[PDB]
Every structure is written in C-alpha cells, then in structure tokens.
Amino acid sequence: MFLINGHAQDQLAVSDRATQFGDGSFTTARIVDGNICHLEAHLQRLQVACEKLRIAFSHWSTLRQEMTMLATGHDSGVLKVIISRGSGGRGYSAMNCQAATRILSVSAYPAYYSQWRKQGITLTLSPIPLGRNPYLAGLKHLNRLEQVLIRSHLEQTDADEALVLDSEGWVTECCAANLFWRTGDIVFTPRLDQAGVNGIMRQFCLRQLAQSPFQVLEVQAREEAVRQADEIIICNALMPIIPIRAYHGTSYSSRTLFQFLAPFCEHPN
Amino acid sequence: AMFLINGHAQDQLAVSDRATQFGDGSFTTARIVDGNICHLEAHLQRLQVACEKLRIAFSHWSTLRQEMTMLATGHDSGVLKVIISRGSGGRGYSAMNCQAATRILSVSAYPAYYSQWRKQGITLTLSPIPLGRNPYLAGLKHLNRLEQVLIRSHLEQTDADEALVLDSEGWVTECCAANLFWRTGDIVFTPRLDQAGVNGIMRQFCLRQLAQSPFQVLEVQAREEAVRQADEIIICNALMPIIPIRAYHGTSYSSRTLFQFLAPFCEHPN
Ligand SMILES: [Cl-]
Ligand SMILES: [Cl-]
Ligand SMILES: [Cl-]
Numbered sequence: 001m002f003l004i005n006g007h008a009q010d011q012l013a014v015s016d017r018a019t020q021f022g023d024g025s026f027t028t029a030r031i032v033d034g035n036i037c038h039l040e041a042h043l044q045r046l047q048v049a050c051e052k053l054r055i056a057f058s059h060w061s062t063l064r065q066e067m068t069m070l071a072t073g074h075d076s077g078v079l080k081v082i083i084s085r086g087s088g089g090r091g092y093s094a095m096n097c098q099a100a101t102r103i104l105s106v107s108a109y110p111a112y113y114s115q116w117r118k119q120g121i122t123l124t125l126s127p128i129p130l131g132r133n134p135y136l137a138g139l140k141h142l143n144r145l146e147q148v149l150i151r152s153h154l155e156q157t158d159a160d161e162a163l164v165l166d167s168e169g170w171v172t173e174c175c176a177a178n179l180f181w182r183t184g185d186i187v188f189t190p191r192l193d194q195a196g197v198n199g200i201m202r203q204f205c206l207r208q209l210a211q212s213p214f215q216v217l218e219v220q221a222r223e224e225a226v227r228q229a230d231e232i233i234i235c236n237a238l239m240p241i242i243p244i245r246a247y248h249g250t251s252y253s254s255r256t257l258f259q260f261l262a263p264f265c266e267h268p269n
Numbered sequence: 270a271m272f273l274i275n276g277h278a279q280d281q282l283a284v285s286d287r288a289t290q291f292g293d294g295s296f297t298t299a300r301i302v303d304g305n306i307c308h309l310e311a312h313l314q315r316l317q318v319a320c321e322k323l324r325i326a327f328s329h330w331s332t333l334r335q336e337m338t339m340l341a342t343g344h345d346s347g348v349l350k351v352i353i354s355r356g357s358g359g360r361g362y363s364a365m366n367c368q369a370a371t372r373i374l375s376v377s378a379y380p381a382y383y384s385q386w387r388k389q390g391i392t393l394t395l396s397p398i399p400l401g402r403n404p405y406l407a408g409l410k411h412l413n414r415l416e417q418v419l420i421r422s423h424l425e426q427t428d429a430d431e432a433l434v435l436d437s438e439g440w441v442t443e444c445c446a447a448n449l450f451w452r453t454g455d456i457v458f459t460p461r462l463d464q465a466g467v468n469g470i471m472r473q474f475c476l477r478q479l480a481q482s483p484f485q486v487l488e489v490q491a492r493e494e495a496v497r498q499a500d501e502i503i504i505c506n507a508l509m510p511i512i513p514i515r516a517y518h519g520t521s522y523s524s525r526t527l528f529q530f531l532a533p534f535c536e537h538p539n
Contacts, residue, residue, distance in 0.1 A: 002284045011281035014272045014373060018353075019282060021414035022292030053415070054422055082290075085418075086512060090380075091446055092414065092421040103284060131465070132437040135419055143413035144291040144362065145323070148355075149405055152324055153364040158511015167402040167437065167464075173483075176362055194437075197402070 003066060003104040015087040016101055017094075022142035024084030024101070025049035027200070029067075030238050031077035031106065032268035036067060038237065041200045046083055049139045050100075056084045057100045066104055075110040078238060084142070084204045113239055116160065120245025120252070123232065124159035125223060126150045126175070130146040130166045130195035138198035150175045161234060163226060168196045171221050177236040178202035181229035182214070182257045188225070194219065201235040201265060214257070233259045240265040273336055273374040285357035286371055292412035293364075294354030294371075295319035297470070299337075300508050301347035301376070302538035306337060311470045316353055319409045320370075325355050327370045336374055337460065346379035348508060352412070383509050386430065390515030390522075391458035393502070394429035394443070395493060396420050399437045400465040420445045431504060433517065435464045443489050447506040448472035449514075451499035452484070452527045458495065462487040471505040471535065478534045484527070492534060501527050510535040 002010050015038060017023035029040045036042065043064060050057045063081070071079055081104050088097040128150045136143070154162045162175045173179060173196040180189045187209055192198045209216045219225070224230060231254040232244035243258040245251065271280050281512045287293035297315050300307040313334060320327045333351070343351055352373040398420045406413070424432045424445060432445045443449060443466040450459045450472075457479055462468045479486045489495075496502060501524045502514035513528045515521070 004284065010284055012284045013270070014274065014280060014282045014375075015270050016289065017418075019286070019289045019373075020412070021418055022412055023415060023418050039489045053419075092417040093425065094418060094422060095425065105284075128405055129403055131403045131406075133399055133401045133416065135398055136401075138414060141415055142290070142292055142413045145293060145411055145413045146293055147402065148287075148293050148364065149323070154366060155363065155365065242453060 001105070003070060005102055006066065007039065012101070012103070013087055016084055017089070018084035018101065018142055019081065019085065021092065024055065024082060025053065025139055025141045026080060026082040027140060028237055029079045029081055030049065030109065030240070030268060031071045031074050033075055034072040036071045036079060037268040038200050039067065041203065042081070045140065045200060046081065049141060050083060052139055053141065055083065055100055057083060058104065063102055070104055070106050074106060078107040078109050080105050080107060082142070116242045117239070120243045121160035122158070123161055123163050123244050123247035124154065124157050125248065126153060126162035126164045128153055130164060130172050131166065132166050132194040134193055137194050138192050139174065140197045147175055163223060165223065169222060171223055171226055172196040174234050177234040177239065179232060179234045180205065181226055182231040183229050185214055187214045187216050187257060188219050188221065191220055199235065200237045201240050204265065205235060205261055208261065212260060230254050233258050233261070235265065272342060272516055275372055276332070276336060277458045282371070282373070283357055285384055286354055287356060287359070288352060288354035288371065288412055289353050291362070293457060294325060294350040294352060295323065295348060295409055295411045297410055300379070300510070301341045301344045301349055304342040304344055305538055306341050306349060308470050308474065308539050309337070311473065312351070315410065315470060316351065320353060321412060322409060323411065325353065325370055327353055329372065333372055340374055340376050344376060348377045350375050350377070354412070361500055386509070386512050390513040391430035392428070393433050393514050393517040394424065394427050395518065396423060396432035396434050398423055399435055400442050402436050402438065402464040404464055407464050407466065408462045410467045417445055433493060435493065441496055442466040444504050447504040447509065449502060450475065450502045450527065451496055452501040453499050455483065456485045456487060457527060458487050458489050458491065461490055469505065470507045474535070475505060475531055478531060482530060500524050501517055503528050503531065505535065
C-alpha cells in the first residue's frame, strides 16, 4: 500500500512523468521507534531536488504531516518518499504541466545490515561508470538506471558492494552509498559536483568530522588511492555506516575511522 | 487517458513498477499513417535491443506486435508510444526475483506543428545542459530522460525551436528530441553515438539511404564549430520525420540539398 497525494492507493496514472521520464526525485529514511531519523534533512534534500529540477511543490507542511503519521507504529522501518512533476506536457516539455505528485510508503528494515556492520563487507570495482552532469550531480533523482546496471553486474561476483567511477575514471561513490577512506590522520571523500548522490549520511559525517582528530579533504581521486588507503567506510541513511574489510585482494583491518563515526550515526535522530 | 497495459485497457499502473521507481526500462515512439505503423519492424528491433542491453526478460514479442497493430488500425494519423519496463519487485536497485516485465502502449494525435516546421525550417540554439557519457546506455531510448527534460526547460527560456546538445566532454551528440546530420560540400556528417544520445530509427534509415547517394558519410566526434561552419543541417526522428535547420548561432542556412535528397524517402510510410 502507498499514500499518493494523501490517498491510500497502490496505483498511479500511467501518464505520470516519473513513469515516462523518471521526472522526479526521492529519499529513503530510516524509522526508529515511530520517529523518522534526520527528518529535516530528508525534507531538505527533497526541496533542493525539486528546486534544481524546477518541480513546483507547495505542500511541504502537508508532506511533513503525512511522513510522521506513517512512521508512527513501526519500531523498525524504511520510509520512501517520491516527488515527481506529475502528469502533462508535450513530449519532454513540462509547459502546462499539472501539479506535482507525492508518493509515500513504509517498508521493512532489512536485517542484513547487522551482519554487514559487524564483519565488514567486500568491495569490487564496477565496470559501469557514472555520467558526468553538474545539473543532476548530488541529487537522488529517479534516473537510476546506472545503479540498476551496477547492481546487476555486482551480482555476478562474490562482492557485497561496488566501487563506482565516473566516466572520466574518478572515484565517486558506491552502488547505493557514499564512501570515505582514510590514510593516517586524513579522511578523504569524493567531491560530488559532477556525479553521485550527495547523501544525507555523507553530509552528516562531514559535519561531525569538521571537529575531530582527522583532517578532511573532498578529492578527485583514482581508484589507486582507495586501494592504498588504510581504511574504507560506506554510508547511507539506512545502514547507516559499514566498514570495508576487503577490496581488490588487499585486506583492511583498521577500524579507527569507523569507531569515531559509528556512535554519531547509529544514534537515530 | 487510456492505455493498454499487459494487454489490459487501464489508465493506472502499479506504483511498485520500476519504470516509476527508477526509469528501469525503455520506449519507442512510432508514426501511424493510414492505420499502418511506419518502420514497425525497426521499432520492435530497437525495443528488443534495449531489453537485451538492460537485461530485461521479455518474451511476448508476437503479442506485442498484434497489440501495436490493433491500436493503430483506423488511425489516418497518430503517434504510437510503447514502454517496456522491468516490472515490479526486487530489493532496492537489485532486480533479483523480479516479477514479469510490463508493456505499456498508447496512441495519441499527430502534432500539426511538424508541417510548419517542415516548410519553414527551424532555429537551433546551443544548450548549456550536457549529456552524461556512458557506453552501457548509449544509443538506447531508455526511460532515464531527465537530461532531455532539463534541455527542453532551458530551451523554453529562448526563442529557438530546438537545441544543439553536447556530451559532458563537449562533443556534438544530438538535439533535444532528434538526431542531427550536417553537410559540407559532398560530405555528410553525423555524431557517433557510442557514448551518449539515442541511435534513432530515423537516423538509421537515413544512414541506409545515404550509402546509395551522391554523398560521402562519416560518423564523427566533432565540436560545435563544425556545426556552425557546415553548409546545411537537418534533424530527424521517427515523427518529424526530417526537418531543415534555417538558423544557428546567428548564421543563416539556405541550402536544402541534403534535405531534398532524404525527404522523399523519409516522408513515405514504411
Ligand atoms: Cl538507498
Ligand atoms: Cl544502439
Ligand atoms: Cl521523440
């Protein structure tokens, strides 16, 4: 079941531009004890996406009410919100386009995160790159065919997550997560001005690493820098953070970065 | 607004469908003339290639042809749009244990503006929006079209009719909803589409005709200066089917030599 523009309803008009063009964006939030973690950041990300995609959306107050009412009742859950431009327009044009569409649903929190969080996971280099486009960089928009292909190629291997480059060979993110790596006292993360999703958990870790025993650099790096790192971690709003135990044959034992961030992230707020 | 979804006349689709979640599929848009679908075989072929390239299992090709031809008969003119998506299911981006693929068909009216475009020629403008480079999606009319939505949006802040579109490295690739050819002297150029853009049904048809022609043909990797300096530019897609460019970047383009050779083949129902 789904809540579409305030109506309990599990079907959407075929003409909707999410279906036609992936014309919209979304966020995925973790539910803990009936409350939505980082609820204000999730609304923020959706607002920034709507603005950058020129999707007029009026019911921010109403959407906040709907999200919190759906979360109450679930001790452990996943709330997904989609905002599309709606139906209408002539081809790709959005002139005379009807009002936007909001789509909310609560799903089950996966259990495999706990096993991942304890033992660490393996990374493999995805052959699928990310297209570079600063008009879409950072946004968790609906055009996610690249991640679908990345996940498909990843499933042909024994690795749990993929290291994903952009079209010019620069480390950008993982398949469904942002990534940080550490060498010594310096923590690195890829700059996302050209591709990738500027995640809520990524923005949260940067806000805490700004007062920490680590230096922080947003970099433009080749995959060698990841292979030569002391420690790698990945993060998204759900995991919320997972360490990397192996990548490209070399083993990663250190947990220094993970142990600093874990108490911040895994406090669900 | 009524569609044929998996053979059933409906106006709604399950929200779980991965077309709605991720743009997980592809489409094609075909012209109808006198109840016949133009280039019908080429449209089934493009959908087939896209499904294979996106790893979407789809076995109902004969059923789909019958549904296409059924919705098209009796329409003197029309536009037939077909979407094939991976369907519903899977965990996140993963497609394992994914339910049956979805097919979506609809017929709408043929726009009258193509005729006045065809007669008077249109204007081009350089789009500030680039196309991401990715050889695993290049050439496919997949559903991840947000780039084309932004291009048209920025185009609507100008006076031009169509946009010249570059990829992220600055190479001429296509227009907003069409492929493009240009000519200098006896040589006809068109961008190679191995990194981005849609390898259109009509681009492919023109390339076949140009192999029996008084023109040399080259698929190139070119900068926008090559377009601005050409003698002639045309654009094409399944519906137009071929439109001449009369103006770009203040330059006037008067010759129609390439347009006059391709138009008799294109403006013939196949
Ligand atoms: Cl996610
Ligand atoms: Cl192709
Ligand atoms: Cl089109």
